[PDB]
Amino acid sequence: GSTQYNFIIDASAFEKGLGNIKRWCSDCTEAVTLNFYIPTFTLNELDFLQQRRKSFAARESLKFIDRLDDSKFANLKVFIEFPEVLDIILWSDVMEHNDSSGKINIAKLPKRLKNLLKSCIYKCYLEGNEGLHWFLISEDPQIREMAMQCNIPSCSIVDVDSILSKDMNDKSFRESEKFNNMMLKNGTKEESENGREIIRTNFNKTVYASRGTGELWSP
Amino acid sequence: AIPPLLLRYQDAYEYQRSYGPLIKLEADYDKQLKESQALEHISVSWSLALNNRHLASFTLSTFESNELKVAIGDEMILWYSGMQHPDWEGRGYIVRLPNSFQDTFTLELKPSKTPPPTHLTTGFTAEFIWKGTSYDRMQDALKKFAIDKKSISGYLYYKILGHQVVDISFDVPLPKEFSIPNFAQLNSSQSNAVSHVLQRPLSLIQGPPGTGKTVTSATIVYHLSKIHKDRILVCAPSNVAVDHLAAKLRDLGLKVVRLTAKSREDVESSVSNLALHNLVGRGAKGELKNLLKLKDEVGELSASDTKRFVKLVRKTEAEILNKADVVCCTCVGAGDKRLDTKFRTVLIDESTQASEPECLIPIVKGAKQVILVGDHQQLGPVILERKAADAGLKQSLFERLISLGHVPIRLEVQYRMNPYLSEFPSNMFYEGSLQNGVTIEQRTVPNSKFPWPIRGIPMMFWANYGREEISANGTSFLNRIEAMNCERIITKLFRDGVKPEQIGVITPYEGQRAYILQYMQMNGSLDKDLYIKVEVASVDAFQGREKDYIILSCVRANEQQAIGFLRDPRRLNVGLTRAKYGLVILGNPRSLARNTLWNHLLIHFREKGCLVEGTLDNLQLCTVQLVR
């Protein structure tokens, strides 16, 4: 396909969302082009989880990354970071994108997280950009908070899965879109104290979601 | 060939295909385990129940207490085969389960033409009859969620699937005051929780230890009952939690109906006056009143009277369940045939102690609004099958919703323990948010003579340099020096006037539990009868409960600095939040300090001046080097 997503994927995204990522690679590369960048942080953190925490999801993620790097798949690009790039990227280049008013003490972060920020800034703003728009995929709130402070756009696995369902135009996207427009039609829009988009609805008027057809597991 | 648990599911069919095989794995493992247990040779002690039925008591040594998923009311067959009497079989029901003090199960035998061989003690085997009802309901709930569009609202369906749909709230009249008049006032944390929940289709409440989740949950149910003017379904994985919540709801003036299985109708309860079967019996008149009296004195009914009896009971049960303000039952109990009606508002307490398919059972009854109460920082569900647990069945619905971005509202004022005891658990597991609802003066003993390292700080980490041993099974560890030190602590508490009921000993290893119990019986300074009343168990036994004094025996001490499942943050959290007045931790800091969680604990104890070593009467600061 002609639409292209450019992602830097962290370790938590693999450990928690490996099944979702596998589906993106095999099914979604029809009308979408996926472009992954695997930083050194990811490989080191997945190795730590597999060895010190006996995480079988982290073991499977490392095996999957090897399969991605060995295959010449259509509409899927994967680049594993060369560790020596971390010594070339300036920490001052990361600090130029950091919000001073931000609550996180960026210079006091551990080595692993300092290097993850270097990888992100390299892709988002430096030589690794290639005229593309990059997003960090993470399932760790601390990682997403530090990325936001350094103007690195980030998303969750669910955020990407929803975006790729829209492009694929599957029944999951279409039926959720009907539900959204049903709420917009019957219900009052409000800006909550949190700043969020809330829709007041009547408790007594409920919309049920069509299930469609499908196969159930049987013993 | 099983699909992994995903973050977002395409549809509820994929959701079912993921959880379905995991339920089967658990079911098969549970069933197979009981098949093996049926081969163990047991000793039976006979007695007579008040109703004059025979009681068979016995100990099952093959499996650990947590591995045998046996409930009161469960049917069993007791078999004799030997050279002292012909072959004999007897069917009965479980009336007592093992506790910390009683290692025995008690089976009440059904009356028969052939009497039981009460003169024999050995030659018996016990076979639990497999029902599978709990797992069947979980499977049915998964399937109903997939194919029945009316089982749950569209919004909740999308939220459970991990989909991104616009957030909605209910146009509902909020009360001016959240605390209920004529009743004890909620604190601001509790009040904020009730406030946040009332207009949301889905809420998560986190209730740390001693923070008042019962009064908060009962107040929520009370307001939702007044707002919707409809039945509310209230659930929890365990019967004790259901009874606790039902009692509070009844105290608020709500018409509560407590549904128990037909198997447990004779179980002793604090809320027996709310049991559906007792409400049928008491509120019966006419033909039903007669059929009940007849069945009580005759013990059996004729074919025509049984059909008539069943018809009338069902009709009465439905009328009682329909007129109720709240229906209370366990999560699995929600799947009962008698509750095949609609429940639009559901509150699930202790939802973190159930698997996701177990929580689904009460939610697939036409739910529009769901409140899940729990604590992912405390104990999770019991998953016997490791492959199923590894595949993700240990994750509750409360925890998956957190991974999906749902922030729980936390109750932050604890009323259980001395402020000194709540500090580390609060900082470590609750981001330092816990405040104290009780003072140091409310949790102190004025004339205490106990050798606490610092007077006024009722905690200590008593370092010992003993080494772990291996028990008679080969599968467990013990620590003879820590067991000896444990007795010295207890005796010292006894000398200070503390009663055995006030003391609890928590140890992760069955080897240590058995050794501590035996050791205090033979080498306890004071009367052995005092020490037997001191509860020695694992964290599971103390989950949801409290003691005035807690002794933690870590057991683990080796040159490799390996500590096994002492690594568990959730177990450590529960073990540190059980005490009200005092805490003593026994352990070897040298090996515990390699673990980063335990290293933070030792540093906290050292900062308080509580990390000590030596003789109890001449304690010294522990010399171990701790490096962060």
Residue numbers in the entry:
A (entry chain B): 0 to 218
B (entry chain A): 224 to 851
Quote from the publication.
Among these, the nonsense-mediated mRNA decay (NMD) pathway is responsible for the rapid detection and degradation of translated mRNAs harboring premature termination codons (PTCs), which can arise from mutations, transcription, or processing errors as well as alternative or defective splicing events. UPF1 is made of 2 structured domains: a CH-domain known to interact with UPF2 and an ATP-dependent RNA helicase domain (HD). Nmd4 is composed of a PIN domain (for PilT N-terminus) and interacts directly with the helicase domain of Upf1. Nmd4 stimulates Upf1-HD ATPase activity and strengthens Upf1-HD binding to RNA.
Here, we describe the crystal structure of the complex formed between Nmd4 and the Upf1 helicase domain of S. cerevisiae. We tried to crystallize this complex in the absence or presence of a short RNA oligonucleotide, but only obtained crystals of the complex in the absence of RNA. The crystal structure of this complex was solved to 2.4 Å resolution. In the Nmd4/Upf1-HD complex, Upf1-HD adopts a conformation similar to that of human UPF1-HD bound to UPF2 or ADP and phosphate, with the largest difference observed in the orientation of domain 1B (rotation of this domain by 17 to 19° relative to the RecA1 domain in both cases; ). The Nmd4 protein is composed of 2 domains. Second, a C-terminal region (hereafter referred to as the « arm »; residues 168 to 218) folds into a long α-helix (⍺9) followed by a two-stranded antiparallel β-sheet (strands β6 and β7) and a long unstructured region (residues 202 to 218) to embrace Upf1-HD. In total, 39 residues of Nmd4 interact with 44 residues located in the RecA1 domain and in the stalk of Upf1-HD to form an interface area of 2,050 Å2. As a result, a parallel β-zipper is formed between strand β7 of Nmd4 and strand β8 of Upf1 at the interface, generating a three-stranded β-sheet common to the RecA1 domain of Upf1 and the « arm » of Nmd4. The side chain of R210 forms 3 hydrogen bonds with the carbonyl group of F368 as well as with the hydroxyl group of S374 from Upf1-HD, while the W216 side chain stacks on the helix α1 and in particular on G243 of the Upf1-HD stalk region. In conclusion, our crystal structure reveals that Nmd4 interacts primarily with 2 structurally important domains of Upf1-HD, namely the RecA1 and stalk domains, and to a lesser extent with the RecA2 domain.
